[PDB]
Short mmCIF file of N, CA, C and O and ligand atoms in Angstrom, two decimals:
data_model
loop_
_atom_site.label_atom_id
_atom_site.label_comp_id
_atom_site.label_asym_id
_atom_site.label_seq_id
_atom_site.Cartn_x
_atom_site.Cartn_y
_atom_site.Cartn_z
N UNK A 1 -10.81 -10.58 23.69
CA UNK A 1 -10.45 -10.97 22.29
C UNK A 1 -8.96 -11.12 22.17
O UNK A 1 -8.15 -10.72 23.00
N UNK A 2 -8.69 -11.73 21.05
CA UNK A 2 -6.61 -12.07 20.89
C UNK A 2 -7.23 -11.45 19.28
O UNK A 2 -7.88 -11.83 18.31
N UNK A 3 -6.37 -10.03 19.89
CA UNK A 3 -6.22 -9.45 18.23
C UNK A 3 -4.93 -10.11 17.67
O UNK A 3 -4.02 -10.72 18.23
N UNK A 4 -5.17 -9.75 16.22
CA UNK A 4 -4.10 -10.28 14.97
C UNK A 4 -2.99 -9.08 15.27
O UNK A 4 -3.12 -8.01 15.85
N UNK A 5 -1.77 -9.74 14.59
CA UNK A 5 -0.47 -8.57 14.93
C UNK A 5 -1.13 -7.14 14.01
O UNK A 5 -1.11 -6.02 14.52
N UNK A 6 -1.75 -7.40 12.51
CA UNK A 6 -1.97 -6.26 11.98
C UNK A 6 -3.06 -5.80 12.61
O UNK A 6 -3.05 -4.58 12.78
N UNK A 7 -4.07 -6.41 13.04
CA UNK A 7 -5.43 -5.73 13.19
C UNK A 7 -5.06 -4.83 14.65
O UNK A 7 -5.74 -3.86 15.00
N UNK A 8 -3.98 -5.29 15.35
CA UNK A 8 -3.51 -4.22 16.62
C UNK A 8 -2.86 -3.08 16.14
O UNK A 8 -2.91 -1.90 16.51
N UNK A 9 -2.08 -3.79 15.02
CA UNK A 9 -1.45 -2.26 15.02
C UNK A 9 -1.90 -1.51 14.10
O UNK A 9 -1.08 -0.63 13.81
N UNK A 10 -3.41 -1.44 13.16
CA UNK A 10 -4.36 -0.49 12.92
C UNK A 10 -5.22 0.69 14.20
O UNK A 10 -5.44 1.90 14.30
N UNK A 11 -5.55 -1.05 15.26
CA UNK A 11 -6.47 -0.36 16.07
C UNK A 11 -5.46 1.03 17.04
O UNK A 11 -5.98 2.06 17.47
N UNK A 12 -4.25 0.71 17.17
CA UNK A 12 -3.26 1.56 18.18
C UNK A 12 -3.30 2.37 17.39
O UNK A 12 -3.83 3.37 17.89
N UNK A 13 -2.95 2.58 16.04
CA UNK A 13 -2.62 3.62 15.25
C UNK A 13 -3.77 4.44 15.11
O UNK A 13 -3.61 5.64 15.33
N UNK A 14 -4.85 4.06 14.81
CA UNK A 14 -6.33 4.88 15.01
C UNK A 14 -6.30 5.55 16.30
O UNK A 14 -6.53 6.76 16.20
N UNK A 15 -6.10 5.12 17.48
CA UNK A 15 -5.94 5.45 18.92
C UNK A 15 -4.95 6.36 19.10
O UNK A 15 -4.87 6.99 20.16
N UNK A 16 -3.97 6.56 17.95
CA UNK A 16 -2.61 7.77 17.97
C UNK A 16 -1.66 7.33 18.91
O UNK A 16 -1.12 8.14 19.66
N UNK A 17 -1.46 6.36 18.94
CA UNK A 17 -0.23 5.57 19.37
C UNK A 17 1.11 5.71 18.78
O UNK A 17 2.18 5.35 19.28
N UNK A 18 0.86 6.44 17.36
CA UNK A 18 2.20 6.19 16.83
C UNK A 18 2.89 7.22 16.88
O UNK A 18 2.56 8.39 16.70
N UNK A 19 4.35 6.52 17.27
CA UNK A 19 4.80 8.32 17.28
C UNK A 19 4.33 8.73 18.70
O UNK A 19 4.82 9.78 19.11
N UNK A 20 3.48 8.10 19.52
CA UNK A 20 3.26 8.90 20.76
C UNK A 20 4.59 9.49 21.66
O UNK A 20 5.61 8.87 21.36
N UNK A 21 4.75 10.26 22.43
CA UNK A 21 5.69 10.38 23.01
C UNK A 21 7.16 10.03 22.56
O UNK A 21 8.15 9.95 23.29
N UNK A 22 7.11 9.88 21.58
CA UNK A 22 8.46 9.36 20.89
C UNK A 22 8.82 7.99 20.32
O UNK A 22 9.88 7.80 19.74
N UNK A 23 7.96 7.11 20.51
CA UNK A 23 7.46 6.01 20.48
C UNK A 23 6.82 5.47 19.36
O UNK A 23 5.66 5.88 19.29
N UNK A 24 7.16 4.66 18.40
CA UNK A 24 6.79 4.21 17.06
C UNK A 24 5.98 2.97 17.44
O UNK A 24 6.09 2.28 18.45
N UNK A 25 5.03 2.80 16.26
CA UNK A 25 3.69 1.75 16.97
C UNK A 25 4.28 0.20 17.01
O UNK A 25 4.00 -0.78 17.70
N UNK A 26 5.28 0.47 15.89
CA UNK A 26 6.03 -0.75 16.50
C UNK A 26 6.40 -1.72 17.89
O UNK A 26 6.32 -2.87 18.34
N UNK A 27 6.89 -0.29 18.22
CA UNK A 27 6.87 -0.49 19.90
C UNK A 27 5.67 -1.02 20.94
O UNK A 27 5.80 -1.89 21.80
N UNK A 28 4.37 -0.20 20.59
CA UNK A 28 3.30 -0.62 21.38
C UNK A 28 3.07 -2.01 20.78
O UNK A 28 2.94 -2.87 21.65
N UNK A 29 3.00 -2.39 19.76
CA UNK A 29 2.67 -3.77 19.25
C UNK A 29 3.69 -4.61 19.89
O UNK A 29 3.22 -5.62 20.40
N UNK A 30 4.96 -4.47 20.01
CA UNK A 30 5.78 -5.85 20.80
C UNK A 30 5.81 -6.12 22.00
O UNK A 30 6.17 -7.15 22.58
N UNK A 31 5.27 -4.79 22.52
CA UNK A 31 5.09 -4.68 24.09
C UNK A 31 3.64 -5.15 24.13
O UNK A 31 3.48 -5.74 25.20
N UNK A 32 2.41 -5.15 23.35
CA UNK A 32 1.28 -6.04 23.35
C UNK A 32 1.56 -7.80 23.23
O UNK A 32 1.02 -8.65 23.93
N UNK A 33 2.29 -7.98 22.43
CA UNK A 33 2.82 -9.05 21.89
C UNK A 33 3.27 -9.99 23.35
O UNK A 33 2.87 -11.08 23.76
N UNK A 34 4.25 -9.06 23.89
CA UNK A 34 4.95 -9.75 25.12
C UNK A 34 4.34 -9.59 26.23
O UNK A 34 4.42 -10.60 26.92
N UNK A 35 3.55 -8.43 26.89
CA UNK A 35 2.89 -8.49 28.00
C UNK A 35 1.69 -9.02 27.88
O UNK A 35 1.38 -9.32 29.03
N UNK A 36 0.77 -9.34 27.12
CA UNK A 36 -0.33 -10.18 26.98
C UNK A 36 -0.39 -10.70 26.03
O UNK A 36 -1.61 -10.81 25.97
N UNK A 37 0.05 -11.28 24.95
CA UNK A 37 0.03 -12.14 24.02
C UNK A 37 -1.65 -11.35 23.21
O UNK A 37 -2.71 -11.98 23.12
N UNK A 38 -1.54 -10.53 22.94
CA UNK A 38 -2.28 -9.94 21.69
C UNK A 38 -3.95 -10.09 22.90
O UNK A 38 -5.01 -9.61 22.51
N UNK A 39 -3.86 -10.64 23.98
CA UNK A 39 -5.51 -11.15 24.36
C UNK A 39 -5.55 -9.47 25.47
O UNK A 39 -4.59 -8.93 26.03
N UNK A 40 -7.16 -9.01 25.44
CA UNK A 40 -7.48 -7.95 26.08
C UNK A 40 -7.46 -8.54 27.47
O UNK A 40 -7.29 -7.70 28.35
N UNK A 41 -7.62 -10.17 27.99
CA UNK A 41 -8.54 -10.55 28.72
C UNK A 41 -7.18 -11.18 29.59
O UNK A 41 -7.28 -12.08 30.42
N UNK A 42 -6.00 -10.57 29.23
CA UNK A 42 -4.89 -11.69 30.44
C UNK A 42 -4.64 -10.76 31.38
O UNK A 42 -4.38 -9.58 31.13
N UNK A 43 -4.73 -11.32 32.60
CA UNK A 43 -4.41 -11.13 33.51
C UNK A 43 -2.68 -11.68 34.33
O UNK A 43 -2.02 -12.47 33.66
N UNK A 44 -2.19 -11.30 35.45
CA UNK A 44 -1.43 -11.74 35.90
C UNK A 44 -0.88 -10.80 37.37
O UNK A 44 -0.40 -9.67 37.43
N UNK A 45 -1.22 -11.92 38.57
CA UNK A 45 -1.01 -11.23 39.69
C UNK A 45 0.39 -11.36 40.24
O UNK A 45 1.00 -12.42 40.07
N UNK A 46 0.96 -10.33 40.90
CA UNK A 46 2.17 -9.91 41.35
C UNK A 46 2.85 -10.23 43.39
O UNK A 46 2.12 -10.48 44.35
N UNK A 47 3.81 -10.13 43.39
CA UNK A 47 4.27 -10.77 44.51
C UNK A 47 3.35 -9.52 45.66
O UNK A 47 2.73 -9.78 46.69
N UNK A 48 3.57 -8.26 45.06
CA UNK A 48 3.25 -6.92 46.04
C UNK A 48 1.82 -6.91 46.26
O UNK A 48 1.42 -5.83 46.70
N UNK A 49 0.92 -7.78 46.08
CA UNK A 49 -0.43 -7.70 45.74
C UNK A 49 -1.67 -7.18 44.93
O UNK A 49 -2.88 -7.04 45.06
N UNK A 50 -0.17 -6.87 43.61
CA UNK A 50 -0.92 -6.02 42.53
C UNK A 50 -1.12 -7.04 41.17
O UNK A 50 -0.45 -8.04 40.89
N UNK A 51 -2.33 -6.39 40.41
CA UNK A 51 -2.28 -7.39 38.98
C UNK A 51 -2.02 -6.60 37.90
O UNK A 51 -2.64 -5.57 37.63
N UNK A 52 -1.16 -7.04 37.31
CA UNK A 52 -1.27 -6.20 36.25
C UNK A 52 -2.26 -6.82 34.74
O UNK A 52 -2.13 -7.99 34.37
N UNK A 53 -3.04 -6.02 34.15
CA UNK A 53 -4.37 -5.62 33.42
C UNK A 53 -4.14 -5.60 32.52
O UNK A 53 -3.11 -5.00 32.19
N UNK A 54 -5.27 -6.50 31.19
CA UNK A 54 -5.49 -6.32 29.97
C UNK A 54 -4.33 -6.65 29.13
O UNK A 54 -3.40 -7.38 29.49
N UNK A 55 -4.48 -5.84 27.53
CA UNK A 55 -3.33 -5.96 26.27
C UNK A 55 -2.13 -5.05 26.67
O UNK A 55 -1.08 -5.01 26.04
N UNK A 56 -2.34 -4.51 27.51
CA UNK A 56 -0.96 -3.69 27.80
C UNK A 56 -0.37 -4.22 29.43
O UNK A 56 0.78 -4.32 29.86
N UNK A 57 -1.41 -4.43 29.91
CA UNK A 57 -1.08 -5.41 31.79
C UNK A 57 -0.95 -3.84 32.22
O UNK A 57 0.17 -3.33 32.31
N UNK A 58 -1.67 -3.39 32.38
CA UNK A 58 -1.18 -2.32 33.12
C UNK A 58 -1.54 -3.00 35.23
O UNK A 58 -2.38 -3.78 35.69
N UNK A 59 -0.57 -2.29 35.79
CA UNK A 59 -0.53 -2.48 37.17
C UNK A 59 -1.15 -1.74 37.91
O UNK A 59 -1.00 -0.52 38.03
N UNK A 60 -2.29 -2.79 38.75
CA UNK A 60 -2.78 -1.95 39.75
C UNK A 60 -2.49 -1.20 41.42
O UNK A 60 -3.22 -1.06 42.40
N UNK A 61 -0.76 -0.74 41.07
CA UNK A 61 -0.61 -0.32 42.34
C UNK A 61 0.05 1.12 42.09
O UNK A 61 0.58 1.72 43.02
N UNK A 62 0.00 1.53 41.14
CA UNK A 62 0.35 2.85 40.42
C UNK A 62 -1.11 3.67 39.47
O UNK A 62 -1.64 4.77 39.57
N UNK A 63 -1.35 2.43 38.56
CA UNK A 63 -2.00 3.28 37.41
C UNK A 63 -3.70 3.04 37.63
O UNK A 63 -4.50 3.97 37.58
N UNK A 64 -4.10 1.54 37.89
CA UNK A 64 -5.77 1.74 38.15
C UNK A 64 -5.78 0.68 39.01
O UNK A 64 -5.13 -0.34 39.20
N UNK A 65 -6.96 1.39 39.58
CA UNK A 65 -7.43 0.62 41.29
C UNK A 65 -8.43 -0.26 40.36
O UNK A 65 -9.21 -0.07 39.42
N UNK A 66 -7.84 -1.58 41.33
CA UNK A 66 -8.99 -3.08 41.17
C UNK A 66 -9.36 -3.22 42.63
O UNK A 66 -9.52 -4.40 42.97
N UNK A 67 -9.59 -2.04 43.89
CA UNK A 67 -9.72 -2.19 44.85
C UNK A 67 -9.31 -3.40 45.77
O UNK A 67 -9.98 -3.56 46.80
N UNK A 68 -8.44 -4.11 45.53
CA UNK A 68 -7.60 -5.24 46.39
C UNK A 68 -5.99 -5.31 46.59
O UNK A 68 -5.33 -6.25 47.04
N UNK A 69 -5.55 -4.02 46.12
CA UNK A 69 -4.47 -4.07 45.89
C UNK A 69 -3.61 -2.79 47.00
O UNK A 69 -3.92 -1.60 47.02
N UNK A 70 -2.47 -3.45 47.89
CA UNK A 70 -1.96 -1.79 48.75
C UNK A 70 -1.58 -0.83 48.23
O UNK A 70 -1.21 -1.17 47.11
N UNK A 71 -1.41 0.45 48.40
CA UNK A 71 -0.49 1.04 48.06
C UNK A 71 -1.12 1.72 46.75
O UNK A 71 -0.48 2.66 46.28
N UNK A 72 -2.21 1.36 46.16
CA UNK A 72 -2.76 2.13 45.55
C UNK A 72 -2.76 3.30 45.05
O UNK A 72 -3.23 4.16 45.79
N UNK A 73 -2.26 3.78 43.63
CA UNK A 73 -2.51 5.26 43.59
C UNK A 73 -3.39 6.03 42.31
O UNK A 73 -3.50 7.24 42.17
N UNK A 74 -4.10 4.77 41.27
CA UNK A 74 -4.83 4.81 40.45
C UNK A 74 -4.28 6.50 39.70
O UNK A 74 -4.98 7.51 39.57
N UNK A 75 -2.70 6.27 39.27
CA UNK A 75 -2.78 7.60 38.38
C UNK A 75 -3.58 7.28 36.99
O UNK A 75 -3.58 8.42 36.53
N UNK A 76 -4.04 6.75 36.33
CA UNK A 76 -4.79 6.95 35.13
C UNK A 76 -6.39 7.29 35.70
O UNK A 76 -7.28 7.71 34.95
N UNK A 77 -6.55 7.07 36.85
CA UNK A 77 -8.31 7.32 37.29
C UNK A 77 -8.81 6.31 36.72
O UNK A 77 -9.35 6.65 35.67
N UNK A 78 -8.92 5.08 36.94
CA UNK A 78 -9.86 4.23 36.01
C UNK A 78 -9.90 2.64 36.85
O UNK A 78 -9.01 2.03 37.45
N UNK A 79 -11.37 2.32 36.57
CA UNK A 79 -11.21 1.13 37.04
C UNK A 79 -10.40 -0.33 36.30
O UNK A 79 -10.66 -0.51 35.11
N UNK A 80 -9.41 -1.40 37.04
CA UNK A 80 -8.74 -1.62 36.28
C UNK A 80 -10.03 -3.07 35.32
O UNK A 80 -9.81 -3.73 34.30
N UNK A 81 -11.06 -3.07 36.07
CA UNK A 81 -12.23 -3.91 35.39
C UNK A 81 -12.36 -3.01 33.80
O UNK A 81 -12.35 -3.66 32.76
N UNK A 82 -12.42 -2.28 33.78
CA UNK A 82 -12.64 -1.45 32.42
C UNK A 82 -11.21 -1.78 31.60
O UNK A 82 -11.33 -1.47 30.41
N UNK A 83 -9.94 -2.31 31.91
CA UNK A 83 -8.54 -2.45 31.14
C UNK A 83 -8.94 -4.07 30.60
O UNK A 83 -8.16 -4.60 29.81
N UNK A 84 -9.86 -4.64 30.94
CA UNK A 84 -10.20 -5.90 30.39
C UNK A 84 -11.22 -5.87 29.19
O UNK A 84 -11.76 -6.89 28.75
N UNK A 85 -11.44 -4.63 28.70
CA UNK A 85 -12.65 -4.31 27.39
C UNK A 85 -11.81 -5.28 26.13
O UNK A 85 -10.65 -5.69 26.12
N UNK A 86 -12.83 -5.43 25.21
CA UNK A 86 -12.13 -6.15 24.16
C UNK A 86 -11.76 -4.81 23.41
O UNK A 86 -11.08 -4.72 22.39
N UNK A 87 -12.24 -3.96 23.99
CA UNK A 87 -12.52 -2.17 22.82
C UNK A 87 -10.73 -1.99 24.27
O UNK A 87 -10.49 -2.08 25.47
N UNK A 88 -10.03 -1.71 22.98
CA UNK A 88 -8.61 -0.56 23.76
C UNK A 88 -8.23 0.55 24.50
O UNK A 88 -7.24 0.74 25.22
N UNK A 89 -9.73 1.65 24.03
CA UNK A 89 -9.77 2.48 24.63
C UNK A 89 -9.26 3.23 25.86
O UNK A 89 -8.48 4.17 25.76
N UNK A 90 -9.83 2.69 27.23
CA UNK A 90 -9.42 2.70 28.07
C UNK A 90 -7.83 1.89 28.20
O UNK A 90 -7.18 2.80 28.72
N UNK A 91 -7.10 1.02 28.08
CA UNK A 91 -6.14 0.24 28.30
C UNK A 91 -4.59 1.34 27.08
O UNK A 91 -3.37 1.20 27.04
N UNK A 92 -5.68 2.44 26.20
CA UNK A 92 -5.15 2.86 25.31
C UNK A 92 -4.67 4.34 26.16
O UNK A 92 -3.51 4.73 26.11
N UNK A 93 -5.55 4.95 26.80
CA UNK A 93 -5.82 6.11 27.02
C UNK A 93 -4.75 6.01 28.59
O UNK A 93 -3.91 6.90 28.73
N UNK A 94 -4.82 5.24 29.35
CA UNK A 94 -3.74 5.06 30.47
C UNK A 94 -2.50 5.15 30.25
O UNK A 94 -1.68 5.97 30.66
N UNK A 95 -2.30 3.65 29.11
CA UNK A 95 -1.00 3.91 28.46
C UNK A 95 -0.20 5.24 28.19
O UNK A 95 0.96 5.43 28.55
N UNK A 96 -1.11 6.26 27.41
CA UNK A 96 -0.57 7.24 27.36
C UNK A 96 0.17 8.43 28.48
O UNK A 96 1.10 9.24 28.41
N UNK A 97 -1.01 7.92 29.68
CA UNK A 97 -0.70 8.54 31.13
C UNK A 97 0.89 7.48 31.30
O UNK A 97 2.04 7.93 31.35
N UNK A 98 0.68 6.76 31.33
CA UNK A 98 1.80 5.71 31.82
C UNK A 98 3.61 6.27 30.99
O UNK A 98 4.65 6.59 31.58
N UNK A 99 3.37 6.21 29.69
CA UNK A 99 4.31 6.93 29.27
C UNK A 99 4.62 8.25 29.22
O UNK A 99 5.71 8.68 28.82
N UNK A 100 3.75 8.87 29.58
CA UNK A 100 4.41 10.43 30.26
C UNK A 100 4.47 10.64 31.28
O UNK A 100 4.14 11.65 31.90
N UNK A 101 4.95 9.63 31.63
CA UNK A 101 5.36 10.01 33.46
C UNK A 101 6.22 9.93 33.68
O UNK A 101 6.40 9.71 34.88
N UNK A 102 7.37 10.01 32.86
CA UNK A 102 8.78 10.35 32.92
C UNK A 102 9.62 9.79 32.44
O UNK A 102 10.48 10.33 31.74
N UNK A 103 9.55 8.02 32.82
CA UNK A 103 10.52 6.85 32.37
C UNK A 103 10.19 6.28 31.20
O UNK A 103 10.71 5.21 30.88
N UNK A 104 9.07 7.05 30.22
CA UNK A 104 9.06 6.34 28.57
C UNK A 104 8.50 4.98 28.95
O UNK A 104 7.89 4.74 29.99
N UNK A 105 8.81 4.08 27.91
CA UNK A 105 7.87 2.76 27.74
C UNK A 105 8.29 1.66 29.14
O UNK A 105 7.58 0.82 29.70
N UNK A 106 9.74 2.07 29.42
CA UNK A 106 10.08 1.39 30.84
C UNK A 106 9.20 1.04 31.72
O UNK A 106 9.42 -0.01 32.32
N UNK A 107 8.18 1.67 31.99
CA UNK A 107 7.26 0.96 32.59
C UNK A 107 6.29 -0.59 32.67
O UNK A 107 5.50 -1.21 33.39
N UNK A 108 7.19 -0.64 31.11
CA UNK A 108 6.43 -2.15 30.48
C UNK A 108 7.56 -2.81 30.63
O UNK A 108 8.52 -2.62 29.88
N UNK A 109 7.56 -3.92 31.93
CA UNK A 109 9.03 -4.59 31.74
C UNK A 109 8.73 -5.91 30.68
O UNK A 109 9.61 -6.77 30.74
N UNK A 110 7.95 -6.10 30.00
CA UNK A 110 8.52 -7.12 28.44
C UNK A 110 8.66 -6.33 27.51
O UNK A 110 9.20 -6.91 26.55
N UNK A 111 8.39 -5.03 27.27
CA UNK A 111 8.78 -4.00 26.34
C UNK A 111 10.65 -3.62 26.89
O UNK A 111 11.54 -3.40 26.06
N UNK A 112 10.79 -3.61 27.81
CA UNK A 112 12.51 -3.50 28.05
C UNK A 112 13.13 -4.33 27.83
O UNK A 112 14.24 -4.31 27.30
N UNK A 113 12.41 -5.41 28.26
CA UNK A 113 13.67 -6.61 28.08
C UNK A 113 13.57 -7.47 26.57
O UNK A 113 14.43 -8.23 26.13
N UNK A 114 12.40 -7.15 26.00
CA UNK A 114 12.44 -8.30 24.99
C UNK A 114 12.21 -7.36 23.67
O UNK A 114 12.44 -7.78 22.53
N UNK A 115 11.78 -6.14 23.93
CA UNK A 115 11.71 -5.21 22.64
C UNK A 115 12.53 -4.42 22.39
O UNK A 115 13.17 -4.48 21.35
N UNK A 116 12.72 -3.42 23.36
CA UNK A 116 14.23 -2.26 23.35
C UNK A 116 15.40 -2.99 22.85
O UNK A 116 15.92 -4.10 23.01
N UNK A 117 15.64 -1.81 22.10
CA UNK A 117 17.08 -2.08 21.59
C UNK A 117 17.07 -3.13 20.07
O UNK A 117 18.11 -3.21 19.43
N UNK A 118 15.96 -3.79 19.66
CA UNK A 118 15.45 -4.31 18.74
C UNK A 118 14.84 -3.39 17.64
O UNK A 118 14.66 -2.18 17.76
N UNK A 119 14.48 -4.38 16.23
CA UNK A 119 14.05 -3.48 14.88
C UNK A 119 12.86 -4.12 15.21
O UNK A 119 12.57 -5.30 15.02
N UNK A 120 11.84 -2.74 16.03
CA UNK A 120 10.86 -2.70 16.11
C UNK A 120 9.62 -2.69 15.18
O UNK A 120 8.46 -3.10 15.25
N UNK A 121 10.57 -1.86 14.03
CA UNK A 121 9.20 -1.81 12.97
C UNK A 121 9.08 -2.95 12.38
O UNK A 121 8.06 -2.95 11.70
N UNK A 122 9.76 -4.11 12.32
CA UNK A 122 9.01 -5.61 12.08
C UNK A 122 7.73 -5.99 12.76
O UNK A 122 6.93 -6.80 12.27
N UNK A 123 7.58 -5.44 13.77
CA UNK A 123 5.99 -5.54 14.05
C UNK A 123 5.00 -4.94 13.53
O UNK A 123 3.84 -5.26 13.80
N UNK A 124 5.32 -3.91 12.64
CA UNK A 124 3.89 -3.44 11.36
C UNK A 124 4.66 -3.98 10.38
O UNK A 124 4.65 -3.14 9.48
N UNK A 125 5.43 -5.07 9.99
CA UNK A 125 5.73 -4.64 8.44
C UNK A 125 5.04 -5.66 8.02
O UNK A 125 5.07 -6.66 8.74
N UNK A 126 4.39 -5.69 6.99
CA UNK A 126 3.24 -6.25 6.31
C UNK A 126 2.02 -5.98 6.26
O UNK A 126 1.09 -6.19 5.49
N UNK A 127 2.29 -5.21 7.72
CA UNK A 127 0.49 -4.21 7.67
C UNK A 127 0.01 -3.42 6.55
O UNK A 127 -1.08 -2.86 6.60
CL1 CL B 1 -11.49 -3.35 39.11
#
Protein backbone atom coordinates (compact mmCIF):
# COMPACT_ATOMS: atom_id res chain seq x y z
CA UNK A 1 0.00 0.00 0.00
CA UNK A 2 1.30 4.00 -0.41
CA UNK A 3 -0.04 5.37 2.80
CA UNK A 4 -1.21 9.17 2.98
CA UNK A 5 1.38 11.56 4.92
CA UNK A 6 -1.47 11.75 7.77
CA UNK A 7 -2.76 8.27 7.72
CA UNK A 8 1.27 7.26 8.46
CA UNK A 9 1.70 9.37 10.91
CA UNK A 10 -1.52 8.09 12.92
CA UNK A 11 -0.53 4.52 12.10
CA UNK A 12 3.41 5.20 13.67
CA UNK A 13 1.94 7.05 16.44
CA UNK A 14 -0.48 4.12 17.43
CA UNK A 15 2.76 1.87 17.04
CA UNK A 16 4.56 4.46 19.76
CA UNK A 17 6.84 5.87 17.47
CA UNK A 18 6.63 9.14 18.89
CA UNK A 19 8.96 10.34 21.03
CA UNK A 20 10.63 6.90 20.60
CA UNK A 21 14.10 7.01 21.65
CA UNK A 22 14.18 10.64 21.41
CA UNK A 23 12.76 10.88 18.20
CA UNK A 24 9.51 12.88 17.28
CA UNK A 25 7.08 11.15 14.69
CA UNK A 26 7.90 13.75 12.57
CA UNK A 27 11.01 12.22 12.03
CA UNK A 28 9.76 8.65 11.26
CA UNK A 29 7.32 10.19 8.71
CA UNK A 30 10.21 12.03 6.55
CA UNK A 31 12.37 9.21 6.80
CA UNK A 32 9.14 7.10 5.38
CA UNK A 33 8.64 9.82 2.96
CA UNK A 34 12.33 9.59 1.64
CA UNK A 35 13.31 5.97 1.98
CA UNK A 36 10.20 4.55 0.36
CA UNK A 37 7.96 7.08 -0.77
CA UNK A 38 5.04 6.30 1.77
CA UNK A 39 4.73 2.48 -0.31
CA UNK A 40 5.19 -0.77 2.19
CA UNK A 41 6.09 -2.63 -1.06
CA UNK A 42 9.59 -0.70 -2.31
CA UNK A 43 12.26 -2.36 -2.50
CA UNK A 44 15.90 -1.46 -3.47
CA UNK A 45 19.08 -3.60 -3.89
CA UNK A 46 22.57 -2.53 -2.79
CA UNK A 47 26.17 -2.71 -4.25
CA UNK A 48 27.19 -5.28 -1.00
CA UNK A 49 24.46 -7.69 -1.96
CA UNK A 50 21.98 -6.44 0.44
CA UNK A 51 18.26 -4.97 -0.11
CA UNK A 52 17.06 -2.78 1.81
CA UNK A 53 13.01 -3.48 2.84
CA UNK A 54 9.61 -2.04 2.94
CA UNK A 55 8.32 1.80 4.38
CA UNK A 56 11.33 2.14 6.37
CA UNK A 57 13.97 -0.04 3.70
CA UNK A 58 15.34 -1.62 6.34
CA UNK A 59 18.75 -3.61 5.22
CA UNK A 60 19.28 -7.02 4.92
CA UNK A 61 22.85 -7.35 6.00
CA UNK A 62 22.50 -6.13 9.62
CA UNK A 63 18.79 -6.13 10.61
CA UNK A 64 16.65 -9.09 8.65
CA UNK A 65 17.75 -12.04 6.66
CA UNK A 66 16.12 -12.33 3.00
CA UNK A 67 18.50 -15.35 2.87
CA UNK A 68 20.60 -14.04 -0.30
CA UNK A 69 22.44 -11.63 1.20
CA UNK A 70 26.54 -12.01 2.88
CA UNK A 71 27.38 -11.10 5.89
CA UNK A 72 24.18 -11.49 7.40
CA UNK A 73 23.33 -10.78 10.93
CA UNK A 74 19.42 -10.48 11.10
CA UNK A 75 19.61 -8.27 14.47
CA UNK A 76 15.78 -7.63 14.51
CA UNK A 77 15.15 -11.70 14.05
CA UNK A 78 12.74 -11.40 11.27
CA UNK A 79 12.19 -12.37 7.93
CA UNK A 80 12.85 -9.43 5.65
CA UNK A 81 9.58 -11.00 3.39
CA UNK A 82 7.45 -10.02 6.48
CA UNK A 83 9.04 -5.92 6.15
CA UNK A 84 6.90 -5.94 2.88
CA UNK A 85 3.30 -6.28 4.98
CA UNK A 86 0.98 -3.49 4.06
CA UNK A 87 0.28 -3.83 8.20
CA UNK A 88 3.77 -1.81 9.82
CA UNK A 89 4.09 -3.90 12.45
CA UNK A 90 6.91 -5.81 11.82
CA UNK A 91 8.87 -2.94 9.64
CA UNK A 92 7.67 -0.93 12.99
CA UNK A 93 8.96 -3.21 15.65
CA UNK A 94 12.74 -3.54 13.93
CA UNK A 95 12.87 0.03 13.54
CA UNK A 96 12.80 0.30 17.05
CA UNK A 97 15.71 -2.42 17.36
CA UNK A 98 17.46 -0.34 14.65
CA UNK A 99 17.37 2.86 16.65
CA UNK A 100 18.67 1.55 19.79
CA UNK A 101 21.60 0.38 18.65
CA UNK A 102 23.48 3.21 19.38
CA UNK A 103 23.72 5.64 16.27
CA UNK A 104 19.86 7.01 16.62
CA UNK A 105 17.96 7.41 13.28
CA UNK A 106 21.51 7.45 11.34
CA UNK A 107 20.91 4.34 10.28
CA UNK A 108 18.36 5.71 7.74
CA UNK A 109 20.65 7.43 5.27
CA UNK A 110 17.51 9.64 3.62
CA UNK A 111 16.56 10.45 7.18
CA UNK A 112 20.33 12.09 7.51
CA UNK A 113 20.67 13.63 4.60
CA UNK A 114 17.33 14.99 3.64
CA UNK A 115 15.54 15.21 7.16
CA UNK A 116 18.14 16.02 10.02
CA UNK A 117 18.71 19.22 10.85
CA UNK A 118 15.21 20.25 9.29
CA UNK A 119 11.54 21.40 10.95
CA UNK A 120 10.49 18.07 11.15
CA UNK A 121 7.19 18.57 12.67
CA UNK A 122 5.86 19.81 9.21
CA UNK A 123 5.37 16.30 8.55
CA UNK A 124 2.30 15.92 11.10
CA UNK A 125 1.16 19.38 10.81
CA UNK A 126 -2.28 19.17 9.60
CA UNK A 127 -2.78 15.81 11.02
CL1 LIG B 1 12.91 -12.87 3.06
Amino acid sequence: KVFGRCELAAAMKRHGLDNYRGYSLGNWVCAAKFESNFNTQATNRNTDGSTDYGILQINSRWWCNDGRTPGSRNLCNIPCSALLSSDITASVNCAKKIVSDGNGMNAWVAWRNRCKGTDVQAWIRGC
